[PDB]
Amino acid sequence: AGPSAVPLGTAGNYVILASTGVSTVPQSVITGAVGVSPGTAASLTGFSLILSGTGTFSTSSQVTGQLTGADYGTPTPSILTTAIGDMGTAYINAATRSGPDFLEIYTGALGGTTLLPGLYKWTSSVGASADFTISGTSTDTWIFQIDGTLDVATGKQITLVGGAQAKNIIWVVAGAVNIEVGAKFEGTILAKTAVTFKTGSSLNGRILAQTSVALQSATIVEK
């Protein structure tokens, strides 16, 4: 049940892919690859990067995985350019889905709700002032199309139930994404505007941002 999956292409090789930068207030705990392009590795800030012996990637205590930027040795820049293209394609693919199952549901106020599989569209902002739930099987899918901002209030969380998997959840969001202190989020975020995960928040998912990503001691686990 739910919409056909959104193709991520090689953007699905990254836990965080950005264009203008990724910052961290230490200590974030990120599992998966972190890439930026056309930003250079100088736009990866707060990571205390160690350049690899091949000059093609770097490492950080904050990342289990490789970091890459547009100024690393070949073939890294070409790989990143392709991934950025794939992110842009994924955003358009997700954003242009039609025939929503749910339109303006809850006026975008998701606290206390359970979200069944489907395509959702809001012309408003969307957020959660209380914990909420995503419920479906291991093969069901969700696409959440948000024209406004997306936010989760401090300390609040999304829980997956029923078998639902974060890899099968997409948020495609035009406005800023703000995940407050200690909140916990799930799914792949396709963002056009800045994405911020504030102190001690977490994501089981992926961040594919066309501008910047700002982390504050966040736990970001690739799904």
Side-chain angles (χ1 to χ4, degrees), residues 1-90 92-223:
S4 61
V6 176
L8 305 183
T10 67
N13 292 338
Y14 300 83
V15 66
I16 299 171
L17 184 66
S19 281
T20 58
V22 185
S23 64
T24 182
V25 179
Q27 190 77 163
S28 293
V29 179
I30 301 152
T31 303
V34 177
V36 63
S37 179
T40 71
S43 76
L44 300 172
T45 60
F47 288 95
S48 296
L49 299 173
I50 299 293
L51 190 65
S52 79
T54 57
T56 57
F57 69 93
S58 60
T59 59
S60 174
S61 67
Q62 290 175 83
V63 177
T64 298
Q66 297 187 346
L67 300 98
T68 51
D71 60 332
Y72 288 177
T74 60
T76 297
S78 69
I79 292 172
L80 283 165
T81 295
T82 299
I84 297 302
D86 290 345
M87 167 169 59
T89 297
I92 292 164
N93 181 291
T96 74
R97 300 306 184 85
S98 57
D101 302 296
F102 309 104
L103 178 56
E104 316 296 5
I105 198 175
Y106 309 122
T107 78
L110 303 183
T113 74
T114 295
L115 307 173
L116 299 178
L119 174 64
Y120 293 69
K121 173 71 171 192
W122 297 267
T123 62
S124 64
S125 293
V126 171
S129 60
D131 291 348
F132 70 104
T133 305
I134 293 177
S135 175
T137 75
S138 72
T139 53
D140 288 339
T141 51
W142 298 255
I143 298 172
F144 298 116
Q145 302 173 317
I146 300 168
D147 293 354
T149 60
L150 171 61
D151 81 279
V152 179
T154 187
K156 305 310 186 198
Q157 63 186 224
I158 301 189
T159 302
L160 305 184
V161 304
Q165 300 196 76
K167 68 175 187 179
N168 290 330
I169 299 167
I170 291 280
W171 305 84
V172 58
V173 187
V177 177
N178 202 49
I179 304 306
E180 261 289 3
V181 168
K184 306 182 177 172
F185 210 65
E186 295 279 345
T188 292
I189 300 167
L190 286 161
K192 192 115 298 225
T193 301
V195 177
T196 302
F197 276 77
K198 299 187 175 270
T199 304
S201 65
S202 62
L203 178 64
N204 292 315
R206 175 178 294 96
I207 307 168
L208 302 177
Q210 291 179 40
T211 63
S212 59
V213 178
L215 306 177
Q216 302 173 358
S217 60
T219 302
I220 311 295
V221 178
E222 194 177 2
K223 299 291 179 177

